[PDB]
Amino acid sequence: HHMISGSVRFLVNLESLNHRTAPVVLKTSTGYLVRYVPVISGEALAHAYQASLVDIAKKEGLPVGSLSSQYEFIKFSTDEALKIEGIKEPKDYNDARRFEVEVMLKDVIADVGGFMYAGGAPVRRTSRIKLGYMIPALRGDEIPAQLEAQFHVRFSAIFNVEVSSALYTFSFELDEDLIAVPSTFGEKVKGEEELERQKAKRVKSAIKALYSLLSGFLPSMKLMSLVVTKTDFPFMPEPAHDDDYIKTTIMRLGKAKGVLNGNLAKAYVINNEGIEVGTVLSTVEDLVVKLEE
């Protein structure tokens, strides 16, 4: 299956950021030090992504559900939601596919972003868009000092932090070939013909929704660099911690392609950072257009 994956580096405004935290571990000469630093959750990123997809879908005439249209991504998770949406719950395990397809036909956000209905016969559709946590980018020759300069952490009277911005990174995976494809076991249902007809447009819209995550719910941030891959095998680029993450990504890309017997392995780069790369594009817009091809 074709997937689009990526690793991105953003310069984030600390005032705008400052509340989730996550651990960072430093190996010292006399042991390990664990400190918690501010992060942006994948859930927050997913909300921004899904809100953007709602706007695209409405512009493009794709179906969006009642609650999703209001940027309320309850997404068919309870009987109250189903009543609001006008969808009957699965009557048995064999009705799971009918239900999933009906939900997908009602709401492209539940298709691309997945959903989970808890009930008598539960149905879970995993998200085709997978967004990692956005955490501090651990680059350069003075990593622990930079963390101390940015955050109220000490790796060993209380004043304001020294600096005003920090580099952050996250990674993502979009399983584009699984968009509009049912995930539940069952015999074919009629609505699948209509999903097939809408698939190309749903995929394009999901790719377009990447623009607002990648261009910089979320704090003020500036795109520094990214590498985004297109593979016909599972692949995740290097996290954007080391400055050689783009170079290292291409190395592993080639190796994985051979190991997993792949036919497609394209890589696109945006570099507003001056880092070494070794297809370089100018803007996120140009990336979107290329990923749609």
Helix (H/G/I), strand (E/B), else coil: 171: strand
Cα–Cα distance, 1 to 181 (Å, whole number): 12
**Contact assessment for residue 235 and residue 251, using Cβ atoms and an 8 Å cutoff:** no
Q: Look up tokens 């109250």; give the residue.
A: 80
Helix (H/G/I), strand (E/B), else coil: 56: helix
Cα–Cα distance, 238 to 231 (Å, whole number): 15
Strand-strand pairing, 135-136 and 165-174? antiparallel
* Residue 233 buriedness (CB in 10 A; 0-12 / 13-18 / 19+): middle
Phi, psi of 281 (to 5 degrees): -115, 160
101's CB contacts (< 8 A; 6+ apart) are 182, 189, 191, 192, 195
Phi, psi of 165 (to 5 degrees): -135, 165
For the chain, helix, strand, coil in percent to 5 are 40, 25, 40
84's CB contacts (< 8 A; 6+ apart) are 66, 67
What domain count does the chain have? 1
**Contact assessment for residue 169 and residue 137, using Cβ atoms and an 8 Å cutoff:** yes
**Contact assessment for residue 23 and residue 191, using Cβ atoms and an 8 Å cutoff:** no
**Contact assessment for residue 53 and residue 205, using Cβ atoms and an 8 Å cutoff:** yes
* Residue 272 buriedness (CB in 10 A; 0-12 / 13-18 / 19+): middle
Strand-strand pairing, 3-13 and 221-231? antiparallel
**Nominal resolution (angstroms):** 2.0
Q: What is the DSSP string of 3-30?
A: EEEEEEEEEEEHHHH--EEEEEEEEETT
For residue 46, the enclosing domain spans 1-293
Q: Look up tokens 């709401």; give the residue.
A: 107
Closest by alpha carbon to 109, among 68, 155, 156, 144? 68
Q: Which two tokens stand for residue 7?
A: 């690793």
Closest by alpha carbon to 1, among 170, 203, 201? 203
> Following CA atoms 200, 204, 206, 209 in sequence, which dihedral angle do they give, to the nearest 10 degrees?
-160
**Long-range contacts, stretch 147-155, CB < 8 angstroms, 24+ apart:** 147/24, 147/35, 147/37, 150/14, 150/37, 151/37, 151/38, 153/35, 153/36, 153/37, 154/35, 155/26, 155/28, 155/33, 155/35
